[PDB]
Amino acid sequence: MVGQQYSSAPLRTVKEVQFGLFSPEEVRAISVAKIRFPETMDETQTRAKIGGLNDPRLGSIDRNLKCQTCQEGMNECPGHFGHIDLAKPVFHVGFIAKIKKVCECVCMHCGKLLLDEHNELMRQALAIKDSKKRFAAIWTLCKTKMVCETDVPSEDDPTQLVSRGGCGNTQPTIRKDGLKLVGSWKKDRATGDADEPELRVLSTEEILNIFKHISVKDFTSLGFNEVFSRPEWMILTCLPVPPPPVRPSISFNESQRGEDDLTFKLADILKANISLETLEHNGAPHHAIEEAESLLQFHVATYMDNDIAGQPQALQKSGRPVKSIRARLKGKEGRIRGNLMGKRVDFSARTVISGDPNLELDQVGVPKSIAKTLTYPEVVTPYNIDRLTQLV
Amino acid sequence: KEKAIPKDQRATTPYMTKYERARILGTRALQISMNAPVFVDLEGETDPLRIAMKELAEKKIPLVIRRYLPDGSFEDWSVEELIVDL
Amino acid sequence: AATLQLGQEFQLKQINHQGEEEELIALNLSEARLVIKEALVERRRAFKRSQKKHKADDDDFMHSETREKELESIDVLLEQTTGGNNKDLKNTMQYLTNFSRFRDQETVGAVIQLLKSTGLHPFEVAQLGSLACDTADEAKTLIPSLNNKISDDELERILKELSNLETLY
Amino acid sequence: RCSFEETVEILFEAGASAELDDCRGVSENVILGQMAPIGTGAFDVMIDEESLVKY
Amino acid sequence: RLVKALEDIMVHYDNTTRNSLGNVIQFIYGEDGMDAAHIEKQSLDTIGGSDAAFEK
Amino acid sequence: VLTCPECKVYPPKIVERFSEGDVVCALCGLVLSDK
Amino acid sequence: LRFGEMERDCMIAHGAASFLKERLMEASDAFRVHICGICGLMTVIAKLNHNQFECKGCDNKIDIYQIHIPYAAKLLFQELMAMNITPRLYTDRSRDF
Amino acid sequence: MFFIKDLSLNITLHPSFFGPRMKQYLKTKLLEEVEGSCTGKFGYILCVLDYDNIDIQRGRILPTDGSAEFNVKYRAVVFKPFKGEVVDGTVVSCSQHGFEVQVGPMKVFVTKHLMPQDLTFNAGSNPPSYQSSEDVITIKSRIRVKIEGCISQVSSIHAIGSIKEDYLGAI
Amino acid sequence: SLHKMSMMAHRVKVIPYSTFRLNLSVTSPYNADFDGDEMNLHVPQSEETRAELSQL
Amino acid sequence: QNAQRDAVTLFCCLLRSRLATRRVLQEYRLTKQAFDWVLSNIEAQFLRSVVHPGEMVGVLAAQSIGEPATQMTLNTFHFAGVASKKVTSGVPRLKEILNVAKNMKTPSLTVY
Amino acid sequence: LRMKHGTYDKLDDDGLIAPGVRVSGEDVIIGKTTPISPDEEELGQRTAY
């Protein structure tokens, strides 16, 4: 009897929770309002701007107006998701390490695994069902093959070379500097050039293109999934916008709305995105484009996690750090350990104790007022209607 | 219906635990308090829990306990045929 | 169902509670009306038998002189078996009664035999039992499934025979 | 596992590996507000029609 | 840390002791299947004593 | 707008019980909105 | 008053699931959510006055379910989904579909 | 379209009905709740066969409220159309935008853009109708409509059909 | 609440004044004395819950 | 069958120890009625000692081990009263056992 | 609008209660009023006056 309403959908109970990842197609299809403006509320200062951060199609938290999408009060609207489109792909702050590890294990040009079924060690690795250990072993084995082999000796005869379709190019060595992934090409000594590894910052779109070219057998071998957990999805292209329930505005007075930190960060994200877009179409020099892309990456990275190692912390206008999404869940007072394992309750009291030698062993003396405040829902039946009537 | 074990091949204890007893008493007390028919000769009692205990004393509660084995199969025991310690 | 797209819920092969595959069953207005009338009168008879247990006239209901008398018997049956809480059932029964092509059980059996002797799809057979078409091409256009599947002479013969089978009111 | 001391990283890894949870432990039935199979919850109570009719 | 480590262990109807995944931790609880509050200290009289006292 | 569906009196008379998280009609005692 | 983790562990030790469930959900925060039967998400839009149930992404209007969960669980799921992760709730008998 | 299908339902019986006559209460509940209903998965629930042969399952008392839930399987005759279906029906109302045709328990609407121009609206006639060179369509006139689409809600299914091609109209 | 015996059921008796009352023999399982300790009271709201508190 | 005999071995040993013929006739002097009563009472009191399925033994074990660990701190440093016995025991030793540390403070080895 | 359930009667004309009055639970002792601009409306809660 929750909701104070009636619905014809059957009641059921949760049995499984299948995790996964959004495809950009899903983010687009789910969303009902493409956020477009860095402002929330109109120039009349009475209603929210349509297409802004507080678009009425997402929902409302106030108790007077109802949601435009579902026409329900604030006590029944869950909230609906928006989305924001990015000019250029951005790395997700939570999968940089996995992206680099899976990048070092795949050829940068042909988009294929550096090994195949011929090697015995590959048979040993593919014999393991545990995905974590499998990936760790494959990484620690294939991190050291900087050149793709065109021909491989046959298992039946080592003197017979079979072509595996490899490109034969030279793979770089990748390191991480802040949010950037920098590669170094160690040219072969037989080329006649010095052993100077040319350095270059790898472009995210190129890495995305490489990942999009991987196949299903390599999908399974690496430890990903075709339906829920493709690696191409680990790089952001569209950013979902949470409804105002997730970021509630506290209104002291009619025109006094203190907004949440999350909406300020989202507004800054969109501001940087539109700045990068307007510089992109204006034919600006490449240096400004690179700087703007770096700023956008910084904002998107510190929107989710604000404790990244080796970087400054995104601060608020008053100097306090911005509370990211991770800091909401990680703490002792966070969601898991502060609102889902233990929580405050109703129909309870708390008071000092004393000693009574006249009471029986299993009997407790309850004060009068505490007995007048707490209740019990007794059901009216033929056996109690007289006493219950007198009680009423 | 493959999970159900035939009555002859029942290999669980023929006594009833304290947890089963508490669950049965709670269910019967709730049903009595929701105006269900009483199967025993009530004598001056007006508390559903005590009438539930009274019905348990004469073994007249018409309920069946289903016990879940770890694999998924189950075993059905009537409340009448479960030995209750006193 | 122009292209016989009946979906999973209405597949030609049905799995019953006994687990054996069965042909999908389709009934026109006459067959459905007769079946529901039989079920209602059987339920009324069961109710009367139960009431007699706790404590002749039924032959006049099935045999109706006229459409109006049949409708009055239908109203009495709904009052005594349904309770009057189901208006959709009353509307469906009225639609069946007003536009029932065939009133007698034997004639309905004749129509069923004529339509399903050729072995056509149950959807097409039920549609032909529901629709009275003067010409074969009219039915073929109004039933796109019947196109390319039945010869025009056979369809014309079936339609003429069905029109002849219609009992005059 | 994410209940204590490594919440967000475990959630990230479970998402990236497409991990399936079965919702049979105590913590999963405490998060979802349901009845865990714990003692009184280890069995099902059902109605016997034969004894009911016999009365 | 201790309570979080062990929180999902339960005596089943097979008398085994398992966890949420179904892995057996003990094939019988306590190796004799007894409640911890029905156990008192008692002395086995056969072990001790000389052979003469035993024989007598 | 929030009106009692039994008194049908306009304008409605309503008292909010903050310490109980309730909205109560001041005539029939009916509880309109909770929490 | 705080019904912490130690209290939950003591109640599990005693073996009283019903008291735990009543304390956790009915006495603090109970919520009713409509979820899609195909994608298993909370994206279903429900107009209760007209009982119009729609899933925009999957074009679903039939397979839609009612679930009783706490409110903090809904907040956690939404915050997880705001970082491009999908907690996809499923039902016991949804394996048939 | 009339078809025979196998259906199941979960029915909750209140604790106050717990007696030797529970089967009778279950049968009454099933008959009073199921017959005449509409489900978008199976269309309108027209009738239930073999009433004496109702299948039953053992109760499972819910742990929260004490109401016993039962699973009941049966065989039923139901009505549901499909895309591209052609059905005869009865004209209900006449309008300038088109017309509405009742077929079985459902309504199929046709817009004026979905009929050939030979059918012209006559408002001065009593009742107003559509008149052509050969076919005249009005109240209680059998009309064939080719259903093009259907919209399914909790309690009903609406339909939209077209008669733009030949061999459509009065029969 | 370190162990099982620190959360127990009781039968109420309505009394004047502002303190809770306990028998002087249950103060050992609670590790509680009467120089300022406060304890917590939770009320069940059903019949099944009441039976669980009374039989377990 | 083998599992059950293995379970009840030691109790059968004690039962044989106490109910020997000479002990019955010479030490207790029981009659037939008292002997039947004793046997019935022994069987009845044994059958009520088995563990009830559904018990959450993990949390019981954890609470039992970790409640004395709280009070263990006080008397840990009694071995601190012997300066030449600087061997880790108490809270740090339990910590090292739980962490499965690969570098103990004071490893040792006893040879017989 | 949005008046509190406390008894405003004990307040003087100045809006401040005077010394020597037995206050009690949920009574008010300071009267404070906030002017609001006309364009600010509480989502239909505010009336004309």
Curated annotation (Swiss-Prot), chain A:
Family: Belongs to the RNA polymerase beta' chain family.
Extra facts: Mutagenesis experiments demonstrate that the minimum viable CTD contains eight consensus Y-S-P-T-S-P-[A-S-N-G] heptapeptide repeats. Identical and simultaneous substitutions in a number of consecutive repeats are lethal: 'Ser-2' -> 'Ala-2' (14 repeats), 'Ser-5' -> 'Ala-5' (15 repeats), '2-Ser-Pro-Thr-Ser-5'-> '2-Ala-Pro-Thr-Ala-5' (10 repeats), 'Ser-2'-> 'Glu-2' (15 repeats), 'Ser-5' -> 'Glu-5' (12 repeats), '2-Ser-Pro-3' -> '2-Pro-Ser-3' (15 repeats) and 'Tyr-1' -> 'Phe-1' (12 repeats).
Region of interest called Rudder loop, as start-end residue ranges on this chain: 306-323
Domain free text: The C-terminal domain (CTD) serves as a platform for assembly of factors that regulate transcription initiation, elongation, termination and mRNA processing.
Complex and partners: Component of the RNA polymerase II (Pol II) complex consisting of 12 subunits. Interacts with DEF1; the interaction is direct and serves to bridge RPB1 to the Elongin complex in a DNA-damaged dependent manner. Interacts with the Elongin subunit ELA1. Interacts with the Elongin subunit ELC1. Interacts with ASK10. Interacts with ESS1. Interacts with RTT103. Interacts with SHE2.
Protein name: DNA-directed RNA polymerase II subunit RPB1
Organism field: Saccharomyces cerevisiae (strain ATCC 204508 / S288c)
Cellular localisation: Nucleus
Binding site for Zn(2+) 2: C107, C110, C148, C167
Chain residues that bind Zn(2+) 1: C67, C70, C77, H80
Residues covered by region (Lid loop): 248-260
UniProtKB/Swiss-Prot annotation, chain C:
GO molecular function, one term: nucleotide binding
BP-aspect Gene Ontology terms: DNA-templated transcription initiation; mRNA processing; nuclear-transcribed mRNA catabolic process, deadenylation-dependent decay; positive regulation of translational initiation; RNA-templated transcription; transcription by RNA polymerase II; transcription elongation by RNA polymerase II; transcription initiation at RNA polymerase II promoter
Compositional bias per record (Basic residues), positions renumbered to this chain: 48-55
Pfam families: RNA_pol_Rpb4 (PF03874)
A GO CC annotation given for this chain: RPB4-RPB7 complex
Disulfide bonds: none
Subcellular location: Nucleus; Cytoplasm; Cytoplasm, P-body
UniProt keyword Methyltransferase present: no
Keywords: Acetylation, Cytoplasm, DNA-directed RNA polymerase, mRNA processing, Nucleus, Phosphoprotein, Transcription
Family indicated by similarity: Belongs to the eukaryotic RPB4 RNA polymerase subunit family.
Summary of subunit composition and partner proteins: Component of the RNA polymerase II (Pol II) complex consisting of 12 subunits. RPB4 and RPB7 form a dissociable subcomplex associated with the 10-subunit Pol II core complex. In exponentially proliferating cells, only approximately 20 % of the Pol II complexes contain the RPB4-RPB7 subcomplex. In starving cells, that enter stationary phase, RPB4-RPB7 is associated with Pol II in a stoechiometric manner. The RPB4-RPB7 subcomplex probably associates with TFG1. Interacts with LSM2 and PAT1.
Listed name of the protein: DNA-directed RNA polymerase II subunit RPB4
Protein species of origin: Saccharomyces cerevisiae (strain ATCC 204508 / S288c) (Baker's yeast)
UniProtKB/Swiss-Prot annotation, chain G:
Domain of life: Eukaryota
Oligomer and partners: Component of the RNA polymerase II (Pol II) complex consisting of 12 subunits.
Subcellular location: Nucleus
Stretches that traverse the bilayer: none
Function: DNA-dependent RNA polymerase catalyzes the transcription of DNA into RNA using the four ribonucleoside triphosphates as substrates. Second largest component of RNA polymerases II which synthesizes mRNA precursors and many functional non-coding RNAs. Proposed to contribute to the polymerase catalytic activity and forms the polymerase active center together with the largest subunit. Pol II is the central component of the basal RNA polymerase II transcription machinery.
Residues bound to Zn(2+): C36, C39, C55, C58
Lineage, opening ranks: Eukaryota, Fungi, Dikarya, Ascomycota, Saccharomycotina
Further remarks about this protein from its record: The binding of ribonucleoside triphosphate to the RNA polymerase II transcribing complex probably involves a two-step mechanism. The initial binding seems to occur at the entry (E) site and involves a magnesium ion coordinated by three conserved aspartate residues of the two largest RNA Pol II subunits. Present with 18700 molecules/cell in log phase SD medium.
Zinc finger (C4-type): 36-58
UniProt-recorded name of the protein: DNA-directed RNA polymerase II subunit RPB2
The family this protein is said to belong to: Belongs to the RNA polymerase beta chain family.
From Swiss-Prot, chain H:
Keyword Cytoplasm (UniProt): yes
GO cellular component, one term: cytoplasm
InterPro entries in alphabetical order: NA-bd_OB-fold (IPR012340), RNA_pol_Rpb7-like_N_sf (IPR036898), Rpb7-like (IPR045113), Rpb7-like_N (IPR005576), S1_domain (IPR003029)
Record bears the keyword Nucleotide-binding: no
Subcellular location(s) of the protein: Nucleus; Cytoplasm; Cytoplasm, P-body
The entry's keywords: Cytoplasm, DNA-directed RNA polymerase, Nucleus, Transcription
Domain of life: Eukaryota
SUPFAM superfamilies, alphabetized: N-terminal, heterodimerisation domain of RBP7 (RpoE), Nucleic acid-binding proteins
Function noted in UniProt: DNA-dependent RNA polymerase catalyzes the transcription of DNA into RNA using the four ribonucleoside triphosphates as substrates. Component of RNA polymerase II which synthesizes mRNA precursors and many functional non-coding RNAs. Pol II is the central component of the basal RNA polymerase II transcription machinery. It is composed of mobile elements that move relative to each other. RPB7 is part of a subcomplex with RPB4 that binds to a pocket formed by RPB1, RPB2 and RPB6 at the base of the clamp element.
Quaternary structure (record): Component of the RNA polymerase II (Pol II) complex consisting of 12 subunits. RPB4 and RPB7 form a subcomplex that protrudes from the 10-subunit Pol II core complex. The RPB4-RPB7 subcomplex probably associates with TFG1. Interacts with NRD1 and PAT1.
Name recorded for this polypeptide: DNA-directed RNA polymerase II subunit RPB7
Species assigned in the record: Saccharomyces cerevisiae (strain ATCC 204508 / S288c)
